[PDB]
Design a protein around this nucleic acid. Sequence first.
RNA 1: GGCCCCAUCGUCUAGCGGUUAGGACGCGGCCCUCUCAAGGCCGAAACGGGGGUUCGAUUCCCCCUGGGGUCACCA
Length: 468
Amino acid sequence: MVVTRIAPSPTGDPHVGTAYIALFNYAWARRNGGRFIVRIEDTDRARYVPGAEERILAALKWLGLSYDEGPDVGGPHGPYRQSERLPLYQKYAEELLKRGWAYRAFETPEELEQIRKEKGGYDGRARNIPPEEAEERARRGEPHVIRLKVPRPGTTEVKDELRGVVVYDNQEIPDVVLLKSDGYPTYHLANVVDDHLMGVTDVIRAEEWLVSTPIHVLLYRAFGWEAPRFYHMPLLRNPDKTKISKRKSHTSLDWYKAEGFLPEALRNYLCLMGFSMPDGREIFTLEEFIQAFTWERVSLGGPVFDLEKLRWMNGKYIREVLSLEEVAERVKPFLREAGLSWESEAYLRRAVELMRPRFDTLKEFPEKARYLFTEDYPVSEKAQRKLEEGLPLLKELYPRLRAQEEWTEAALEALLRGFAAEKGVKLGQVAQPLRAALTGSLETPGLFEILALLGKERALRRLERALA
RNA sequence: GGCCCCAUCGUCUAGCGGUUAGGACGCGGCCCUCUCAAGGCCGAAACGGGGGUUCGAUUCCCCCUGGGGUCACCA
Ligand SMILES: Nc1ncnc2c1ncn2[C@@H]1O[C@H](COS(=O)(=O)NC(=O)[C@@H](N)CCC(=O)O)[C@@H](O)[C@H]1O
Ligand SMILES: [Cl-]
Ligand SMILES: [Mg+2]
């Protein structure tokens, strides 16, 4: 059938590139009624960042993905952490040794640096060590690595499902280290052994790996295994076209979550990076994505990750895809994180409704609608100016307001409209300064809905401090 | 620098021999209107260069340019 996987490396924050690739693997597996695996590639102890693994697993679930086999969901071919499979790689590295497909190299890091300076890259000198002496020197505990014994001279063909066949000259393929002197494997060894053992048949990873692929094709041969299909995706980029990175862009998924980006939108956005719906539609669900997926509709150029369009899409979701109630729920954490409180669910909901079209991130709601939840709100210089200029007519309106019994948006509007008429003045000349008195701002939702919201007492109690 | 991949508006893209080269973000204008948004309408904005193939190239082939990847006991 079809078995795909995402093989994150726990070395930092949950990378957006990781989500991007995981999405295409998830779609392809489901579209074929296959399996989607998660394998944690923690083989480099120097770059290992404790706490990374949980964070990446949480981020994929947050985005809406699900996996069938993995670290925390079990599976027939585990463990799903390479660090727990160490003995396994040893066994296969030694098997290559016997098949004559690899050799032991004893050079120190320093000698290798020197060889690289003279000949540029390892020259395979350890191949000239009699196999018996190599084995003997190993039993003595002498530190060493196992390298892939590339067939020289020759040519190695890689088949990319998206670009056709690409020919590599074995002279372009180094005798890569398979097993490190600390007994840990290199990405190359672990990847093939594990992809094979876990049944993967469709390898989808970014294009940065295409040139390493020939090494993998040769490993599958050395073991006498069948190679899976390869699909190399384009690399997400910084605005300056360089491979996306933390110094020039936001690459951390936990950053997007903390900024109030809806996971559904971030997901939707990531799908338009190298893929597009038949009918050009750009707002769609994860389920529609799976259903429409097709390699024929994948673009191969490296897409710039545009934060502005992401904000736009996030706002589109907030106002057209989610219900008023879903938005009101997702806003709470951000209200709490801002130290604001809401009286009740009804109040919150109405507040969110009034602001729905005025914020693109959940974090912006507490910011722009602060005056609706606390009395501790800023007053813009522009709002203060408009307040003083209209102070006189607000004083003449105050008594009319205190007299008003039906505190409804409809009633209030008819009241103020009439007040502006009799005073021979545009509603705006009385509506603008009242807005500043109530909100401390000049950019808010409709006055009547804002006036009604708090209730007669609350609204007037604030209008009074303004006239004071 | 060697090797490999890629190439339509500023950005994400549709196109898959013949189109007024379409859509989206963003940008400008207009309508809406009590502010700001949201929404609607209009607009400016692209096929990197040179060869070919073909009646006919954005599209098919070659070269150059640009961008990216890799040449690590990193992934
Ligand atoms: N800027 C970018 N744009 C788009 N995709 C990007 C990316 N950066 C990383 N990726 C892709 O995300 C997945 C995991 O990245 S990663 O944590 O560094 N780990 C690894 O690359 C290796 N553990 C796995 C390689 C493989 O899948 O065979 C891998 O599929 C990797 O290719
Ligand atoms: Cl990074
Ligand atoms: Mg145009």
